[PDB]
Design a protein around this ligand. Structure first.
Ligand SMILES: Nc1nc(Cl)nc2c1ncn2[C@H]1CC[C@@H](CO)O1
Length: 225
């Protein structure tokens, strides 16, 4: 079943531009993943204004983050609109999305004339690739109302997509899972991530939770808002 794909040339070049742009600010990857989740949440919310059964698969609209230090994984899950198999292949593997080409051009000039590019990335919502600053592997599990649950996975040298054998566990939404580099083990620490989630979510119109503990050990979603 597992079908392999090569990234489109432009995306390879875009990945490199993005990476070298935030290379001294690796922490910004989290802000972009949260921003992406926010976008996905706004889409499903707008769709709910028309489609009455829009939220059936998952009546909540949240962003939930969890550190799995023991597995060296960081997970960013949203109950947003999700992506069908085709959207996983197209949105992550190519520049087809309308204004992505515009970003490639502006981001290239800006970077040339010493202008800030940090805002461009957030502006055109192409911050997903900054995950490769702290991850050796990025896995995107997604469930869209019009398709079954799939998994996209990449080490940046190519990518695969397979139907998720685990069935439909998300309900609706997306999970970005990062297999962190050694140099980034820090992002496995609750205190660190929790701090980042707050410094980058105070402007999100959706509730943002981090799976934290007290310590007898109590585990539950802590609202960072
Ligand atoms: N979390 C995401 N949810 C949805 Cl529905 N789409 C996403 C998400 N993260 C990334 N994408 C899509 C939109 C931008 C594109 C390239 O980063 O991939």
């Amino acid at each position: 079943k597992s079908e392999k794909f090569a990234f489109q040339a432009e995306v390879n070049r875009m990945m490199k531009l993005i990476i070298n742009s935030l290379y001294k600010n690796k922490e910004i990857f989290l802000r972009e993943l949260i921003s992406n989740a926010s976008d996905a949440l706004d889409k499903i919310r707008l769709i709910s204004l028309t489609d009455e059964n829009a939220l059936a698969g998952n009546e909540e609209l949240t962003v939930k983050i969890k550190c799995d230090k023991e597995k060296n994984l960081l997970h960013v899950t949203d109950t947003g609109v999700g992506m069908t198999r085709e959207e996983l292949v197209k949105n992550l593997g190519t520049i087809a999305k309308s204004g992505t080409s515009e970003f490639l051009n502006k981001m290239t000039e800006a970077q040339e004339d010493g202008q800030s590019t940090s805002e461009l990335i957030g502006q055109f919502g192409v911050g997903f690739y900054s995950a490769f600053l702290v991850a050796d592997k990025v896995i995107v599990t997604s469930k869209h109302n019009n398709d079954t649950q799939h998994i996209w996975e990449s080490d940046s040298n190519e990518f695969s997509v397979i139907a998720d054998p685990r069935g439909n566990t998300l309900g609706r939404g997306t999970t970005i899972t990062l297999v962190l580099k050694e140099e980034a083990s820090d992002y496995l620490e609750l205190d660190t991530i929790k701090n980042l989630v707050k410094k980058y979510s105070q402007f999100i119109n959706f509730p943002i939770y981090v799976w934290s503990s007290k310590t007898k050990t109590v585990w539950d979603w802590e609202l960072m808002n």
